[PDB]
Design a protein around this ligand. Structure first.
Ligand SMILES: CCCCCCCCCCCC(=O)OC[C@H](COP(=O)(O)OCC[N+](C)(C)C)OC(=O)CCCCCCCCCCC
Ligand SMILES: CCCCCCCCCCCC(=O)OC[C@H](COP(=O)(O)OCC[N+](C)(C)C)OC(=O)CCCCCCCCCCC
Ligand SMILES: CCCCCCCCCCCC(=O)OC[C@H](COP(=O)(O)OCC[N+](C)(C)C)OC(=O)CCCCCCCCCCC
Ligand SMILES: CCCCCCCCCC(=O)OC[C@H](COP(=O)(O)OCC[N+](C)(C)C)OC(=O)CCCCCCCCC
Ligand SMILES: CCCCCCCCCC(=O)OC[C@H](COP(=O)(O)OCC[N+](C)(C)C)OC(=O)CCCCCCCCC
Ligand SMILES: CCCCCC(=O)OC[C@H](COP(=O)(O)OCC[N+](C)(C)C)OC(=O)CCCCC
Ligand SMILES: CCCCCC(=O)OC[C@H](COP(=O)(O)OCC[N+](C)(C)C)OC(=O)CCCCC
Ligand SMILES: CCCCCCCCCC
Ligand SMILES: CCCCCCCCCC
Ligand SMILES: CCCCCCCCCC
Ligand SMILES: [Cu+2]
Ligand SMILES: [Cu+2]
Ligand SMILES: [Cu+2]
Ligand SMILES: [Cu+2]
Ligand SMILES: [Cu+2]
Lengths: 382, 236, 382
């Protein structure tokens, strides 16, 4: 819900999310929904964004309407920040547990230490039930099971109320007598030395000694109880395992790319060379969370968000099968209302008019090839 | 008569209006207020911004102009009892200023932290921002200016000169509003992380310090209270 | 002597020293002792430590009880800071010449520009003789041989004493007359203009002119003598040649790792897959300067420090030979007094409870394989 405002070229060339899947579209309270997919770190990472040396796999959502039970990059849990390598493809998996009823737009996002949020596609997930039924149990290494919704809440309230009461008692003790104007007049007109006299000093000594003694006793008691404590666990985690993708058998060279101002379409001319031994066909163009599909070649079945999905938004001038070894140049047009709804047309406002995306090529048997394209995007006005 | 029930209204108007504002932002925070380019955002928060800015400008102009036009020309022939009554009215103005300062610089500022700490900010005019900078700040600025003008135009102690502590207390917290430019500039450009303790925030802190001039302002009001009707009793 | 205080996890995952050897254990004055070995830069380099872009091969020792005659990374001398690559293994060689008699704990260490000292294993080396017998000769490109112990000492003493004498002469010249109270009274009561009169100004002019002239003449004389001088030679040295190790034929997956609190043992469950064509057996586990050995598989003969060596500290549940292609899961326990002496048990205080180490696998013929393992280390209390 935080994208459509970021720069179009920055959304195009940071991170490409694909193979996204959602386990469920509608859940009950305490029910789990799992989000899977892959993201590729673009080679032409913008210089204004710091390299993803420190990155965190986050969830885009309006507060804890879900709780993040687990999150994985590769196959290993990532509760801390992680290091990503430019040009690598990683697979991710986020497990969410429903907490608050309603209709929520859930995004998978990557926060980069020096570049800000990179928001992936968002999907509407319905939560039904009552928040009062939500439980977040956890078992500690000390052998006790607690609910994270209310654990330590009573202790926190008690201690804060106790110390607030001590401070209020001090202030009220001094506030029983007249406060401002008579004391000001006494201090000004001659030496005061009358508004602070025993047993006021004795009361202050008692307050100070009691404060120190209570702090020490409370610390000792909180050490006898909970004798086993550990510090906060933090630190960027290295050695994220990237996907070992096979080398693509399709090479694509972008010969100019244009978009009409104003308009809802993007046009580019591609020289596609088919290696390997199977006839390929262009089935998809993904630019920034928007999938332009050639419906005659490929159809989406993973429940991709409709406002981000162009079922027939990809038109190829000659999308006949491309025989192996054969090279041809075609005009590819990606047109959909999403191009203007998600403000991908506002790249005219950007200080770097370059686009990047993913082309998905499909053969007859159905196996697909992913190739990455990037080129300057030239607006056309007449 | 002396202190009258204008203090009750001073507390209640801010309390009720800001409770309604909190209800409004609780209802329209999500669901017309998350997406800054949705049409419903324009009808529920951009319209709110426009209406509140126009109403704040009109109210500030009317209030300040009325206070300045009804200024007491013959301050010399003011009885001590009337001076005491005017001092109490000025204290009511200061109470209203303190209440508005609380609502602006604590409640809506920190609630703002929560907002940003929970969502991806989509614009310089988040539904909540509209509430803090374009309401929790102009309202307290208007109240502070009105209190300063009332002191200058009704209290002989605060007449015949501009009180430095009062001017600081009134203008420093006002400088937080133009400081929003530094907030925006150093959110989009400088600093991309949502950290409340980032240096892009020291402009709010520096001018929040100037509210400490309330100490000199209040000792000045104490002296103004204790001019003719200082007692006796006190120091007797 | 500076380790046992650093964080256990940081000592575990920075740099792993192995194949360490010492040419001699007891030396005479002016005798040379050589320290050799390999160090591997861990892939999971902690984010709190700057990457070893600028690193220096240092020696941990109590002052110049030895002098570093030579130091090598790869096969080339490294008198300056060097650049190391994460994940690479380098071989090193430090040549030390004994200078001060006594029993010294000599460590090989790596200082990293933004992370501080990484101290390797330390070995007690005895030095016998007299410091007065120590010589540090060196031959310059100008054809003169000097002893670095006392070269230029006389000149330094002479010049410092000369300038100190000049300053003392100035102060004493002004201090022959009364100093503080009469001069203060003269300055206060009326214009002074009497305590600074000729020939005081002439003496000051002489002092200034003589100072400038002596500085110029001394510089010219020190330029006529030693006509050939070079600036200090500094600068990080790139292109350190890492070892080209063969790819290991053993793959190990750590399935949980635990240590008792309190305790002197660490337990982990490993899934070991044997590739290649020889039966392997687990012989060693090195975690942080501590070598846990399975005495039935391997014995140390390189004179490793005893307090860092656990001869039978490594117990494997099933350490029978692992046939090629076969995969088995075993429980490995590393237990020794060193685990508590070197405070490796204090990882419970650390904000990142993850360990790293090296497993050494040996076959029947004796050739060994080095595999690296890293996993979270979970304390157990009951
Ligand atoms: C120092 C001088 C300050 C000046 C600024 C004051 C700002 C006032 C609010 C701006 C509203 C806006 O701009 O929005 C206009 C809103 C948009 O809501 P709607 O879509 O019509 O839904 C129906 C309305 N509900 C959602 C509120 C039910 O509707 C309105 O007409 C209602 C605005 C009522 C404001 C007066 C009540 C305040 C609480 C009572 C104690 C004072
Ligand atoms: C007479 C005295 C007045 C001087 C004040 C003028 C404003 C300075 C403008 C800086 C522009 C510049 O110099 O350079 C701009 C540099 C270039 O960095 P980058 O490579 O784009 O980094 C990329 C990192 N992003 C993507 C986050 C930008 O961005 C900066 O680091 C901004 C540093 C903050 C300086 C402003 C501090 C204001 C203090 C406010 C406290 C009250
Ligand atoms: C006599 C007093 C001297 C004051 C000392 C000032 C130097 C401190 C700045 C260090 C910069 C830094 O390192 O930043 C620390 C983290 C940034 O986190 P990061 O993005 O991970 O940084 C990674 C890149 N660094 C670490 C190399 C920069 O938070 C900050 O931005 C600093 C917050 C400062 C809060 C304390 C100041 C209180 C304000 C009081 C006035 C209103
Ligand atoms: C919706 C806006 C309504 C604002 C109403 C403003 C009322 C007019 C201001 C004013 O002049 O005084 C009102 C009261 C009582 O003081 P008065 O005596 O009426 O003021 C003049 C003094 N004089 C009679 C001796 C000449 O003085 C007060 O203490 C009133 C405090 C009101 C709180 C401030 C509200 C500002 C919100 C932006
Ligand atoms: C925006 C940031 C403010 C900058 C701070 C500058 C003001 C600080 C000093 C100050 O307030 O004094 C101005 C007067 C006080 O009386 P004096 O300054 O003595 O002069 C009175 C004659 N004058 C009204 C034309 C100024 O006070 C008034 O007369 C104000 C009431 C009249 C203005 C009403 C019209 C404004 C409508 C928007
Ligand atoms: C001194 C500052 C008081 C701030 C209290 C506040 O923000 O109240 C809003 C909150 C809203 O929670 P709730 O009471 O459950 O009502 C929800 C209504 N909305 C969502 C519109 C806020 O609770 C109340 O309205 C209690 C009334 C306190 C009067 C001083
Ligand atoms: C009164 C203390 C002020 C200390 C300033 C500070 O903490 O700045 C941190 C920042 C270091 O940037 P960093 O924290 O790494 O920011 C990470 C996020 N980006 C890269 C988007 C800015 O340094 C600067 O850019 C210069 C600040 C000038 C202050 C007058
Ligand atoms: C001057 C007060 C110092 C208090 C020290 C208390 C130490 C208690 C150790 C648990
Ligand atoms: C990246 C280093 C930033 C250093 C900022 C220093 C601020 C000091 C303020 C006087
Ligand atoms: C005012 C004194 C300047 C001295 C300059 C000496 C230059 C000597 C060149 C070797
Ligand atoms: Cu969304
Ligand atoms: Cu990509
Ligand atoms: Cu901010
Ligand atoms: Cu030592
Ligand atoms: Cu290693």
């Amino acid at each position: 819900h935080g994208e459509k405002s970021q720069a179009a070229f920055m959304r195009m060339r940071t991170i490409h999310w694909y193979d996204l899947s959602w386990s469920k579209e509608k859940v009950k309270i305490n029910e789990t929904v799992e989000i899977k997919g892959k993201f590729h770190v673009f080679e032409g990472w913008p210089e204004t964004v710091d390299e993803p040396d420190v990155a965190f796999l986050n969830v885009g959502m309006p507060g804890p309407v879900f709780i993040r039970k687990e999150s994985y990059i590769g196959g290993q849990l990532v509760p801390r920040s992680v290091r990503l390598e430019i040009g690598k493809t990683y697979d991710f998996r986020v497990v969410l547990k429903a907490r608050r009823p309603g209709d929520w737009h859930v995004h998978t996002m990557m926060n980069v230490q020096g570049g800000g949020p990179i928001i992936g596609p968002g999907k509407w997930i319905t939560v039904e039930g009552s928040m009062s039924e939500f439980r977040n149990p956890v078992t500690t290494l000390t052998g006790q099971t607690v609910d994270l919704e209310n654990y330590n809440e009573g202790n926190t309230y008690f201690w804060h109320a106790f110390w607030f009461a001590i401070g209020v008692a001090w202030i009220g003790y001094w506030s029983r007598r007249p406060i401002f104007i008579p004391r000001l007049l006494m201090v000004d007109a001659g030496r005061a030395d009358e508004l602070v006299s025993a047993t006021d000093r004795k009361v202050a000594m008692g307050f100070l000694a009691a404060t120190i003694l209570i702090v020490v006793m409370a610390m000792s008691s909180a050490n006898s109880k909970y004798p086993i404590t550990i510090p906060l666990q933090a630190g960027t985690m290295r050695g994220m395992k990237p996907l070992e993708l096979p080398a693509p058998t399709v090479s694509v060279k972008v010969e100019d790319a244009t978009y009409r101002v104003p308009g809802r379409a993007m046009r580019m001319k591609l020289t596609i060379t088919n290696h390997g031994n199977s006839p390929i066909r262009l089935g998809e163009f993904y630019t920034a969370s928007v999938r332009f599909l050639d419906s005659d070649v490929y159809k989406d079945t993973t429940g991709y968000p409709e406002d981000l999905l162009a079922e027939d938004g990809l038109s190829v001038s000659d999308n006949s099968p491309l025989a192996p070894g054969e090279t041809r140049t075609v005009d590819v047009t990606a047109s959909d209302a999403a191009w203007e709804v998600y403000r991908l047309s506002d790249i005219i406002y950007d200080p770097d008019s370059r686009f990047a995306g993913l082309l998905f090529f499909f053969d007859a048997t159905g196996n697909r090839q992913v190739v990455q394209i990037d080129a300057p995007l030239i607006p056309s006005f007449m | 008569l002396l202190d009258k029930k204008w203090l009750t209204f001073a507390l209640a108007i801010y309390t009720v209006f800001y409770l309604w504002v909190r209800w409004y932002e609780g209802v329209y925070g999500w669901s017309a207020g998350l997406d800054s380019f949705a049409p419903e955002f324009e009808t529920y928060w951009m319209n709110f911004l426009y209406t509140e800015i126009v109403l704040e400008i009109v109210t500030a102009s009317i209030l300040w102009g009325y206070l300045w036009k009804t200024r007491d020309r013959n301050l010399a022939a003011l009885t001590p009892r009337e001076e005491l009554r005017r001092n109490f009215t000025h204290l009511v103005w200061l109470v209203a200023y303190a209440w508005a300062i609380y609502w602006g610089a604590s409640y809506f500022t920190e609630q703002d932290g929560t907002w940003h700490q929970t969502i991806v900010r989509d614009t310089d005019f988040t539904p909540s921002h509209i509430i803090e900078f374009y309401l929790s700040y102009p309202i307290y600025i208007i109240t502070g200016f009105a209190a300063f003008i009332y002191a200058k135009t009704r209290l002989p102690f605060f007449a015949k000169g501009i009180s430095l502590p009062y001017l600081v207390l009134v203008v420093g917290p006002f400088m937080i509003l133009p400081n929003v430019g530094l907030n925006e500039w150093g959110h989009t450009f400088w600093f991309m992380e949502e950290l409340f303790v980032a240096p892009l925030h020291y402009g709010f802190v520096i001018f929040g310090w100037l509210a400490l001039a309330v100490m000199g302002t209040l000792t000045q009001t104490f002296y103004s209270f204790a001019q003719g009707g200082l007692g006796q009793s006190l120091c007797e």
